[PDB]
């Protein structure tokens, strides 16, 4: 996250970090005690992934961290990386042992399709992650967060040479300086509804992070709500 | 009183019902409150809630 602020501990208790050969290569969100939702491009190879819930400062031990191994990866049935690595960019991770829910490890709410789309239409969401804090710069140590406004589709299409399908949305600022970045992919875009946060997007991709005229591209969660509920039911 | 106007005054979800009334509802782990609009926690750690002191 570029142009964000340090989260306080437990401020985004649904946030998880994915660790592999590199740490904090992607983010994720807690669906329930056994399931994480992330981007499909984060987990497209069959590599071992470590999920850490209750994380705050990725280079300090703080007591609240719960580490789990991923036993099953479910990319969306319409995901096809050979065709497009960033279309239907959503996956579910099944954990080896359930998380212990507490004030630092809490799921994100997921509304039905209609309400997930109404919540996105409020026009302002929070994104969070341990991604880069400058374009081509270092990753964050402390979890970062940022409020991002929804960007209209036409402005969004005019900003990039790549295709933006209707299952994606753009968010960010016309002047640049504030955006998600590499390492934040797979993390949550959430909308606060009278003090309860609902998952409205998955952080997906972009080009020059926070460059004036560019925006962050996100997967619309509303399209996948039924599939998430079906696959993650305990 | 309809779900198009201020979400029927429902905190989370609204459904239009008979005689120009609405029925509010909540996501998993919440209970519809006695005031018929608000959503109260029904489990120890309900989704989407910040419970750690932010002070
Ligand atoms: C907001 C945000 C911005 C990001 N920027 C980067 C990358 C630079 N972007 C690319 O390599 C790229 C390109 Cl050029 C084309 C497509 N693409 C093609 N067809 N559809 C989509 C997709 C990508 Cl990710 C980077 C790499 C290294 C350092 C910094 C940034 N990752 C990001 C993730 C986020 C969440
Ligand atoms: Na830590």
Residue closest to A168 by CA, chosen among A223, A98, A225: A223
Host domain of residue B44: 1-55
Two structure tokens written together for B24: 């509010």
Alpha-carbon span A13 to A101, nearest angstrom: 10
| Experimental technique behind these coordinates | X-ray
Largest CA distance in chain B: 46
Alpha-carbon span A106 to A26, nearest angstrom: 19
Number of domains observed in the structure of chain B? 1
Q: List the CATH number of the domain containing B32.
A: 2.10.25.10
* Residue A127 bridge partners (DSSP): A146, A189
Is A124 annotated in the active site?
no
Residues with CB under 6 A from ligand 1: A 86, 132, 135-136, 162, 179-182, 184-185, 203, 205-207, 209, 216
Nearest CA to ligand 1 atom 3: A206
**Residues recorded for chain B:** 55
Domain A13-107+223-234 sits in CATH at: 2.40.10.10
Count CB neighbours of A162 within 10 A.
12
- For residue A184, the SS3 value is coil
Query: Is A175 annotated as a binding-site member?
Result: no
Contacts of A125 in chain B (CB under 8 A): none
Query: Is A102 annotated as a binding-site member?
Result: no
Is A29 annotated in the active site?
no
Alpha-carbon span A46 to A72, nearest angstrom: 10
**Mutational test site, ligand 1, from A90, A125, A168, A182, max ligand atoms within 8 Å of CB:** A182
Alpha-carbon span A110 to B47, nearest angstrom: 9
The H-or-E segment that residue A27 falls in is strand A26-32
E-strand ranges in chain B read 13-17, 21-25, 30-32, 39-41
Question: So where are chain A's domains?
Answer: 1-12+108-222, 13-107+223-234
E-strand ranges in A57-167 read 66-75, 91-95, 124-129, 144-151
Count CB neighbours of A205 within 10 A.
20
Whether the CB-CB separation of A34 and A110 falls below 8 Å is answered with no
Counting Cβ atoms within 10 Å, is residue A99 exposed (0-12), middle (13-18) or buried (19+)? buried
Q: What are the distances in angstroms from CA A34 to CA A93, A96, A126, B33, B55?
A: 8, 8, 24, 29, 31
CB neighbours of B26 closer than 8 A, spacing ≥ 6?
A: B11, B12, B13, B32, B39, B40
Determine whether the interchain pair B51/A109 forms a contact, defined as Cβ–Cβ distance below 8 Å: no
Domain A1-12+108-222 sits in CATH at: 2.40.10.10
Is A89 annotated in the active site?
yes
Residue of A nearest to B11 (CA): A194
Ligand 1 atom with the smallest distance to the CA of A135 is 29
Cα of A24 to nearest chain B Cα, Å: 23
Alpha-carbon span A186 to B53, nearest angstrom: 27
Count CB neighbours of A84 within 10 A.
14
Select which of A185, A197, A204, A222 is catalytic: A185
Contacts of B54 in chain A (CB under 8 A): 8, 10-11
Whether the CB-CB separation of A155 and A217 falls below 8 Å is answered with no
Tell me, yes or no, if A9 comes closer than 8 A to chain B by beta carbon.
yes
Whether the CB-CB separation of A148 and A127 falls below 8 Å is answered with yes
Determine whether the interchain pair B48/A103 forms a contact, defined as Cβ–Cβ distance below 8 Å: no
Alpha-carbon span A222 to A224, nearest angstrom: 6
Resolution given for this structure, in angstroms: 1.9
What is the Rg, in whole angstroms, of the alpha carbon atoms belonging to chain B?
13
Residue closest to A107 by CA, chosen among A200, A32, A8: A32
């Amino acid at each position: 996250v570029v142009g964000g602020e340090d989260a306080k501990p437990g401020q985004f208790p649904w946030q998880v970090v994915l660790n592999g050969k590199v740490d904090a290569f992607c983010g994720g969100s807690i669906v329930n005690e056994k399931w994480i939702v992330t981007a499909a491009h984060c987990v497209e190879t069959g590599v071992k992934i470590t999920v850490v819930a209750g994380e705050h400062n990725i280079e300090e031990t703080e007591h609240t961290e719960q580490k789990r191994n991923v036993i099953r990866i479910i990319p969306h049935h319409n995901y096809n990386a050979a065709i497009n690595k960033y279309n239907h960019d959503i996956a579910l991770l099944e954990l080896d042992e359930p998380l212990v829910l507490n004030s630092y490890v809490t799921p994100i709410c997921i509304a039905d399709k209609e309400y997930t789309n109404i919540f996105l239409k409020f026009g302002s969401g929070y994104v969070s992650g341990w991604g880069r804090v400058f374009h081509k710069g270092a990753s964050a140590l402390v979890l970062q967060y940022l409020r991002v406004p929804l960007v209209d589709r036409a402005t969004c299409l005019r900003s990039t040479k790549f295709t933006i399908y209707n299952n994606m949305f753009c968010a960010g600022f016309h002047e640049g300086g504030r955006d998600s970045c590499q390492g934040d992919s797979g993390g949550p875009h959430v909308t606060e509804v009278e003090g309860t946060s609902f998952l409205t997007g998955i952080i997906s991709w972009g080009e020059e992070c926070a460059m004036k005229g560019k925006y962050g591209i996100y997967t619309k969660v509303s399209r996948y709500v039924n599939w998430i509920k079906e696959k993650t039911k305990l | 009183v309809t779900c198009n106007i201020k979400n029927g005054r429902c905190e989370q979800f609204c459904k239009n019902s008979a005689d120009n009334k609405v029925v509010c509802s909540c996501t998993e782990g919440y209970r519809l409150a006695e005031n018929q609009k608000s959503c109260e926690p029904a489990v120890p750690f309900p989704c989407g809630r910040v419970s750690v002191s932010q002070t």
